[PDB]
Design a protein around this ligand. Structure first.
Ligand SMILES: Cc1cccc2c1nc(-c1c(F)cccc1F)n2Cc1c(F)cccc1F
Lengths: 427, 558
């Protein structure tokens, strides 16, 4: 209501001006949802209609909340974040707890509604302007700016931090074992307890917040036998990187070894020091492909050796907090996607795989959206920052359907690749 | 008159100041022309006299055309515009006729003296000061400043539209069945009432506007359908593009081919079939504008054929939300696709094409999926939803391809429509080296400086060939090698290459390339029963790299 609070002065990173990003075309269904959501926001004083003397713009979208109960507005502040928070990464930064990754269980709670109660500095509102679009350009577009801290803007958590640390104290005392990290609109809660004890301290936490004002959405796998695992529980234990296999055979054909000399010639870029000296000689003749030719002992000595140089990682582990994390994904087989996170080529800080096979939701774009949201969540946990993805997909297809399976409140930076990878079958 | 509208607060870019441009005194012929005008404008409130305390100035001119009985005051704001802040871009989105919904009655209203009726921000007025130059030296200096939206200022269209939109609401709040479209200084009113009950509303609206100071000279709303807006010809129940008169010249300059292609594209949004493949190739020039780009012979059949389609005019219909949207696509030629979107049997909503010049090698399916994507985006902008597609491809062809393509893809609801030509994969590579089949170790290589190369192979059975090639690149030879192997082998063959270039082009299962070599290769594969391609590291001495890479020493060596 009328809860007056001095506002924290927010300023853009000198040189830079407010954002002016184009609003993607939305479906009528999503437009209707936006105008309904937005009209409530306006009665509650959260947003205000603006005039033409405001030239700025930031994209808006509509995504469905858990279980598809009802719609949720998702503001794409990537550009604004880059123009601000980069220096609200310095002035009001939030330290990243290096033990959160070691926890046995991590729950993610949506604490975004908190923000809507802290008023935003008046000279900054102007920059949060957004346009709910019009079908077929028949009407101008409804235009609003924010009066309170918005949800996907990195300055909101930077400013609410004070209120957070305070509200959480009583609980961090009663629970010194539990690690709590805030990222944008989510709280990441980790412990080493048993999945039954943990899930218990989490709703303990939910009530502590509620006891003090903040809210948080409820589960479905406890009272109403909801066929779903919607409340995020991750376990950074099972996290491992060993997709680099070598074919273990008894009957070696010319074809076989050729491929092996190949995979090994690529692997050679990651791990300097493994060579095919002896294998690249048993292939010196021009023999039929399908002609068994069981390795000379010298080869078996090189193959055996290599089978190992792999499991023993490189120096690599040099996470430069001054650089960006890049994530590449490759459509593997059927319902399987591999990925690598790095900062310099061939020096992987991490590799993985994802899979939920094409049957129930046998869609490509739906899988890709899922793998992008998992790889990101992981990165928030390990490094406290999101990566820039290199998505193997056509731009327009992706811009058309990403927001149809998106369930997260943040959006990572991305770009598209058009050239096939020869980094495909090698893991 | 001047409206009691609220003024939108305007401001100059950060750290700038009002213009101080210099205006050349003008012929006393036109100094009286101005005074008459400004006197009438001042009487009416539009402008006001102030020059002592006003350190700024913008040049003023005067132009009169016999195509009139009086003068016209013209001011060059281009310097003030340079220092005026940015505004919410007026409207970089015009509707498309095919998305307008069937209305029973439409009426455009001209609202002329739009801008001079809307007040201007008190604080900004001083930066609009112009100066009228005296007869000779008898120059006391007669200067005025605007109290309303100037005719060529940067924020006028935006501030006008905003103001008009607020004037309209207390009126469309009382009249829910009336829909209103704003464009420049035209109001288009639409409704589903009997023309009788409609003209009554148009009159009320006119009186409503009149109370806000805006005049709609259009007595009775005397505007004439068909309406001509943004190159469109709009009727009460159909729309079409304005007349397309393709010139008939003996010699065409690069500039004349553009305006030509321009019109042909514009007309394609409703005339099925228009082709632009050859009239567009021509413009592959580096420095030309008058270069007499000589029309070719294929580009000659095209221009004639489009002239034939433009023969009898075509019309498209409006949209009805209660029916379905459908889009059909058929393959036109090579690289060209056409499609139409409709709700019913034979009255298109809109037409269109899609061509692909992505470098040169693409697959018939990859192109179809792209076409589906381009249509989908368009539908979302025009109608707010996606259509059902009818596509010349079998669910089996498609699935085989996406399931094996490295990129992730998607395509809404679609049904098969048997109509030639039909999309399909002309050949598939084997996934396993064939047994008993001969094995060709293929190699090629050219000299960059000399442009002389050679292509060859050595099979396991001792078969060998080497053919000398002139005027070539390391990529033509690398494909010549694969081509020779395909030429001398049986119906099942195993080929091995060092070249990632050649392996990629073929793996992409292309079909009607802009390279006869790749077309020669494609023609072979299709003829084969089983082909299996394999790749091994180029210069790391293998069987192929030691045997097939040494016979290429019969020219340049090292
Ligand atoms: C069925 C029809 C035919 C010709 C012109 C039409 C039209 N409907 C509108 C229209 C509308 F679709 C929404 C609100 C008010 C309207 F008048 N306009 C006017 C019109 C446009 F809406 C867009 C471009 C040109 C134009 F004439």
């Amino acid at each position: 209501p009328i809860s007056p609070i001095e506002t924290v002065p927010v300023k853009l990173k000198p040189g830079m001006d407010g954002p002016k990003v184009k609003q993607w075309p939305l479906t009528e269904e999503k437009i209707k949802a936006l105008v309904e959501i937005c009209t409530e926001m306006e009665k509650e004083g959260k947003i205000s209609k603006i005039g033409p003397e405001n030239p700025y713009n930031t994209p808006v979208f509509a995504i469905k909340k858990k279980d598809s109960t009802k719609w949720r507005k998702l503001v794409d502040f990537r550009e604004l974040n880059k123009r601000t928070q980069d220096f609200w990464e310095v002035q009001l930064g939030i330290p990243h707890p290096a033990g959160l990754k070691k926890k046995k269980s991590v729950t993610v709670l949506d604490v975004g509604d908190a923000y809507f109660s802290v008023p935003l500095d008046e000279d900054f509102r102007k920059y949060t302007a957004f346009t709910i679009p019009s079908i077929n350009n028949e009407t101008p577009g409804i235009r609003y700016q924010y009066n309170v801290l918005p949800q996907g803007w990195k300055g909101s958590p930077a400013i609410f931090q004070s209120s957070m640390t305070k509200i959480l104290e009583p609980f961090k005392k009663q629970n010194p074992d539990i690690v709590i990290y805030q990222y944008m609109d989510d709280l990441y809660v980790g412990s080493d307890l048993e999945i039954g004890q943990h899930r218990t301290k989490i709703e303990e936490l939910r009530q502590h917040l509620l006891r003090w004002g903040l809210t948080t959405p409820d589960k479905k796998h406890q009272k109403e036998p909801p066929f779903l695992w919607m409340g995020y529980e991750l376990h950074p234990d099972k996290w491992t990187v060993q997709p680099i296999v070598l074919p273990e055979k008894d009957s070696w054909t010319v074809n076989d070894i050729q491929k092996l000399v190949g995979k090994l010639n690529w692997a050679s870029q990651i791990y300097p020091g493994i060579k095919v000296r002896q294998l690249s000689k048993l292939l010196r003749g021009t023999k039929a492909l399908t002609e068994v030719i069981p390795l000379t002992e010298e080869a078996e000595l090189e193959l055996a050796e290599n089978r190992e140089i792999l499991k023993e990682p490189v120096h690599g582990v040099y996470y430069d907090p001054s650089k960006d994390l890049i994530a590449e994904i490759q459509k593997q087989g059927q319902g399987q996607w591999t990925y690598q996170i790095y900062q310099e080529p061939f020096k992987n800080l991490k590799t993985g795989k994802y899979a939920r096979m094409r049957g129930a939701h046998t869609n490509d774009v739906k899988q890709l959206t899922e793998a992008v949201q998992k790889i990101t969540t992981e990165s928030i946990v390990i490094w406290g920052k999101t990566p820039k993805f290199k998505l193997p997909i056509q731009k327009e297809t992706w811009e058309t359907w990403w927001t149809e399976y998106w369930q997260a409140t943040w959006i990572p930076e991305w770009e598209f690749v058009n050239t096939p990878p020869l980094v495909k079958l090698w893991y | 008159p001047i409206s009691p509208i609220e003024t939108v607060p305007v401001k100059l870019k950060p750290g700038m100041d009002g213009p101080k441009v210099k205006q050349w005194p003008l012929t006393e012929e036109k100094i009286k022309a101005l005074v008459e005008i400004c006197t009438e404008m001042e009487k009416e409130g539009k402008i006001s006299k102030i020059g002592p305390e006003n350190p700024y100035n913008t040049p003023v001119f005067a132009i009169k055309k016999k195509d009139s009985t009086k003068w016209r005051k013209l001011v060059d704001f281009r310097e003030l515009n340079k220092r005026t802040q940015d505004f919410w871009e007026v409207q970089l989105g015009i509707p498309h006729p095919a998305g307008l919904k069937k209305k029973k009655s439409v009426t455009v209203l001209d609202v002329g003296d739009a801008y001079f009726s809307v007040p201007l921000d008190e604080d900004f007025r001083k930066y609009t000061a112009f100066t009228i130059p005296s007869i000779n030296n008898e120059t006391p200096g007669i200067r005025y400043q605007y109290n309303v939206l100037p005719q060529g200022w940067k924020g006028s269209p935006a501030i006008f539209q905003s103001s008009m939109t607020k004037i309209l609401e207390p009126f469309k709040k009382q009249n829910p069945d009336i829909v209103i479209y704003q464009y420049m200084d035209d109001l288009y009113v639409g409704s589903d009432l009997e023309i009788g009950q409609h003209r009554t509303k148009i009159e009320e609206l006119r009186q409503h506007l009149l109370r806000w100071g805006l005049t709609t000279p259009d007595k009775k709303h005397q505007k004439e359908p068909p309406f001509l807006w943004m190159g469109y010809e709009l009727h009460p129940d159909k729309w079409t593009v304005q007349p397309i008169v393709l010139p008939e010249k003996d010699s065409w300059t690069v500039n004349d081919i553009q305006k030509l292609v321009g019109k042909l594209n514009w007309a394609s949004q409703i005339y099925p079939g228009i082709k632009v493949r050859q009239l567009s190739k021509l413009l592959r020039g580096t420095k030309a504008l008058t270069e007499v780009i000589p029309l070719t012979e294929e580009a000659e059949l095209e221009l004639a054929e489009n002239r034939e389609i433009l023969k009898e005019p075509v019309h498209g219909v409006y949209y009805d939300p209660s029916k379905d949207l459908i889009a059909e696509i058929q393959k036109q030629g090579q690289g060209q696709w056409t499609y139409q979107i409709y709700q019913e049997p034979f009255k298109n909503l809109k037409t269109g094409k899609y061509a692909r010049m992505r470098g040169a090698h693409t697959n018939d399916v990859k192109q179809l999926t792209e076409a589906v994507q381009k249509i989908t985006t368009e539908s979302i902008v025009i109608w707010g939803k996606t259509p059902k597609f009818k596509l010349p491809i079998q669910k089996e062809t498609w699935e085989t391809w996406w399931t094996e393509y490295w990129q992730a893809t998607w395509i809404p609801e679609w049904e098969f429509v048997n109509t030639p030509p039909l999309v399909k994969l002309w050949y598939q590579l084997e996934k396993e080296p064939i047994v008993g089949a001969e094995t060709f170790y293929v190699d090629g290589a050219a000299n960059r400086e000399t442009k002389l190369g050679k292509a060859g192979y050595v099979t396991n059975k001792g078969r060998q060939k080497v053919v000398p090639l002139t005027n070539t690149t390391n990529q033509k030879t690398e494909l010549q090698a694969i081509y020779l192997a395909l030429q001398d082998s049986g119906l099942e063959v195993n080929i091995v290459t060092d070249s990632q270039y050649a392996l990629g082009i073929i793996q992409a299962q292309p079909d009607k390339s802009e390279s006869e070599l790749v077309n020669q290769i494609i023609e072979q594969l299709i003829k084969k029963e089983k082909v299996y391609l394999a790749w091994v590291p180029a210069h790391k001495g293998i069987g192929g790299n030691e045997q097939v890479d040494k016979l290429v020493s019969a020219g340049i060596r090292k």
